[PDB]
């Protein structure tokens, strides 16, 4: 019955890395925010680098992207994302306006959706950020069906952080800041359908915001707002502008979740922290394999497994039943586990609070950069990311590490598709002659199986034979490329990751 300190310390270091620009912070930081004893941050962090949840590049501590796998289990299991976001989508680039959808998180509103256009003298906010309720359209919305711990939640927040502070996502609540009226306009809000934002973030941000009701109970599911600026509309004008074009996309929403096929949770899951006990192992003290365990819980969760049972939950880890309750638990009071229907538990918005909204904007050519510099030390040559240029017959080089035509390149044989790299899985191009200089390379997809960048290793042909390149460099190209694809496929899941 009692809580798992590890875990809740371990979420306590990612909470304090989310917050942190870059993601990232030093392990001296990390003892300085978290009150952490330096033996315990080394540990965590040294479990969590080994989970591939964090990387450490000296005396830093960076997040990385399968961190995002966490977040990606409680949109999975959402479905809101997947079946709503190609709608949302679709309405910011007809009105050529900011859209987007939040979820309510107790005292405030985390974002599920982000598309913003126009957005240039206005701050934005990412899939995961948390705004707080009084300061959106999109709280009132939410608060209408608070309960009353809901608002005792709601009251305990605004005493304790008078100045908002902790939203780092938005402007500290200045002096002297008139009252939001946060009741009156949450019954406002239930008696109207919508809701109107008038520069409560800042000077010239203004928006409006229509609840999409679930179509099984009625309840608010999720909140779609258009966002706008005072050089275009007024908070007035935007509602009498459109709202009525809002009320007509949320309708199709709802239908969208009315007409939802039931979801696929894949082939049944075992033994997903089975894993643990062999890293246990091998790093000893330096492996804390209860926080590994305890985050691993998370991802039992996804499509179609939105609510388990302690049984479920597991079957599905491999764990002990007294581990697994333990674990659920200590989640439990770190606010990403609720209880649900049927002695269930269920995934809350608050696991997007791991890492989340900074790595959401992590490009193609950031994920590869670590892994082309440890490439290029692995074989003591110069490493590569690439992709084709706007003319569609020449390269663009995106990343780099050191140690004309795409069709003269091996990266180019690679992007253009080529007959011999489409059945080899590589090209090998010895692509100056006078100079001696000879590449190999191979592609990089996407989850959907789509080339988007290539990989290559560069070096001088000297004596070394073409067999001899392949034999040695191929192996660790592929390797270097496999990773770079699996954090591409978790980043990628509920995020468009750029390639340049």
């Given at each position: 019955?009692?809580?798992?300190?590890?875990?809740?310390?371990?979420?306590?270091?990612?909470?304090?890395?989310?917050?942190?620009?870059?993601?990232?912070?030093?392990?001296?930081?990390?003892?300085?925010?978290?009150?952490?004893?330096?033996?315990?941050?080394?540990?965590?962090?040294?479990?969590?680098?080994?989970?591939?949840?964090?990387?450490?590049?000296?005396?830093?501590?960076?997040?990385?992207?399968?961190?995002?796998?966490?977040?990606?289990?409680?949109?999975?299991?959402?479905?809101?994302?997947?079946?709503?976001?190609?709608?949302?989508?679709?309405?910011?680039?007809?009105?050529?306006?900011?859209?987007?959808?939040?979820?309510?998180?107790?005292?405030?509103?985390?974002?599920?959706?982000?598309?913003?256009?126009?957005?240039?003298?206005?701050?934005?906010?990412?899939?995961?950020?948390?705004?707080?309720?009084?300061?959106?359209?999109?709280?009132?919305?939410?608060?209408?069906?608070?309960?009353?711990?809901?608002?005792?939640?709601?009251?305990?927040?605004?005493?304790?952080?008078?100045?908002?502070?902790?939203?780092?996502?938005?402007?500290?609540?200045?002096?002297?800041?008139?009252?939001?009226?946060?009741?009156?306009?949450?019954?406002?809000?239930?008696?109207?359908?919508?809701?109107?934002?008038?520069?409560?973030?800042?000077?010239?941000?203004?928006?409006?915001?229509?609840?999409?009701?679930?179509?099984?109970?009625?309840?608010?599911?999720?909140?779609?707002?258009?966002?706008?600026?005072?050089?275009?509309?007024?908070?007035?004008?935007?509602?009498?502008?459109?709202?009525?074009?809002?009320?007509?996309?949320?309708?199709?929403?709802?239908?969208?979740?009315?007409?939802?096929?039931?979801?696929?949770?894949?082939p049944p899951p075992a033994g997903l922290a089975l894993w643990t006990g062999a890293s246990k192992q091998e790093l000893g003290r330096?492996?804390?394999?209860?926080?590994?365990?305890g985050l691993t819980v998370l991802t039992a969760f996804g499509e179609g497994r939105s609510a388990l049972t302690l049984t479920q939950?597991?079957?599905?880890?491999?764990?002990?039943?007294?581990?697994?309750?333990?674990?659920?638990?200590?989640?439990?009071?770190?606010?990403?586990?609720?209880?649900?229907?049927?002695?269930?538990?269920?995934?809350?918005?608050?696991?997007?609070?791991?890492?989340?909204?900074?790595?959401?904007?992590?490009?193609?050519?950031?994920?590869?950069?670590?892994?082309?510099?440890?490439?290029?030390?692995?074989?003591?040559?110069?490493?590569?990311?690439?992709?084709?240029?706007?003319?569609?017959?020449?390269?663009?080089?995106?990343?780099?590490?050191?140690?004309?035509?795409?069709?003269?390149?091996?990266?180019?044989?690679?992007?253009?598709?080529?007959?011999?790299?489409?059945?080899?899985?590589?090209?090998?191009?010895?692509?100056?002659?006078?100079?001696?200089?000879?590449?190999?390379?191979?592609?990089?997809?996407?989850?959907?199986?789509?080339?988007?960048?290539?990989?290559?290793?560069?070096?001088?042909?000297?004596?070394?034979?073409?067999?001899?390149?392949?034999?040695?460099?191929?192996?660790?190209?592929?390797?270097?490329?496999?990773?770079?694809?699996?954090?591409?496929?978790?980043?990628?899941?509920?995020?468009?990751?750029?390639?340049?």
């Amino acid at each position: 019955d009692e809580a798992v300190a590890p875990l809740l310390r371990g979420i306590a270091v990612l909470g304090r890395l989310t917050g942190a620009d870059g993601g990232t912070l030093s392990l001296s930081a990390l003892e300085r925010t978290t009150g952490l004893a330096r033996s315990t941050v080394d540990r965590l962090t040294a479990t969590l680098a080994r989970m591939g949840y964090v990387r450490l590049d000296g005396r830093d501590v960076v997040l990385a992207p399968r961190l995002m796998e966490l977040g990606n289990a409680y949109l999975a299991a959402l479905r809101l994302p997947a079946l709503l976001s190609a709608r949302a989508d679709g309405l910011a680039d007809e009105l050529d306006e900011s859209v987007s959808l939040a979820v309510g998180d107790r005292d405030g509103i985390r974002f599920i959706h982000q598309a913003t256009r126009r957005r240039a003298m206005s701050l934005s906010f990412r899939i995961g950020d948390l705004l707080p309720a009084e300061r959106t359209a999109p709280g009132p919305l939410f608060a209408a069906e608070w309960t009353a711990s809901d608002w005792h939640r709601w009251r305990e927040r605004r005493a304790a952080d008078p100045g908002d502070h902790s939203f780092p996502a938005v402007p500290p609540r200045e002096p002297g800041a008139p009252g939001e009226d946060f009741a009156r306009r949450a019954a406002k809000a239930a008696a109207d359908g919508w809701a109107l934002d008038d520069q409560l973030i800042e000077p010239g941000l203004v928006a409006v915001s229509v609840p999409v009701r679930d179509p099984g109970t009625g309840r608010v599911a999720c909140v779609a707002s258009v966002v706008s600026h005072t050089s275009r509309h007024t908070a007035p004008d935007l509602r009498a502008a459109l709202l009525p074009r809002l009320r007509a996309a949320v309708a199709a929403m709802e239908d969208d979740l009315r007409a939802a096929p039931a979801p696929e949770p894949g082939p049944p899951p075992a033994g997903l922290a089975l894993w643990t006990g062999a890293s246990k192992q091998e790093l000893g003290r330096e492996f804390v394999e209860s926080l590994a365990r305890g985050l691993t819980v998370l991802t039992a969760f996804g499509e179609g497994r939105s609510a388990l049972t302690l049984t479920q939950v597991a079957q599905a880890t491999g764990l002990a039943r007294a581990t697994a309750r333990r674990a659920l638990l200590t989640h439990a009071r770190a606010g990403l586990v609720a209880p649900a229907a049927g002695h269930t538990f269920t995934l809350t918005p608050r696991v997007l609070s791991l890492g989340f909204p900074p790595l959401s904007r992590t490009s193609l050519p950031e994920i590869a950069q670590p892994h082309l510099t440890a490439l290029a030390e692995r074989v003591h040559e110069s490493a590569s990311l690439a992709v084709l240029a706007d003319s569609g017959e020449e390269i663009q080089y995106t990343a780099r590490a050191s140690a004309l035509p795409a069709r003269a390149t091996a990266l180019g044989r690679v992007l253009l598709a080529l007959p011999e790299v489409r059945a080899r899985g590589y090209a090998l191009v010895d692509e100056e002659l006078e100079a001696g200089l000879r590449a190999i390379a191979v592609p990089v997809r996407d989850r959907t199986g789509r080339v988007v960048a290539a990989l290559n290793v560069a070096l001088h042909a000297a004596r070394r034979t073409a067999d001899d390149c392949v034999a040695q460099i191929l192996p660790e190209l592929r390797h270097t490329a496999d990773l770079v694809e699996t954090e591409l496929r978790v980043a990628g899941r509920f995020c468009r990751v750029a390639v340049v």
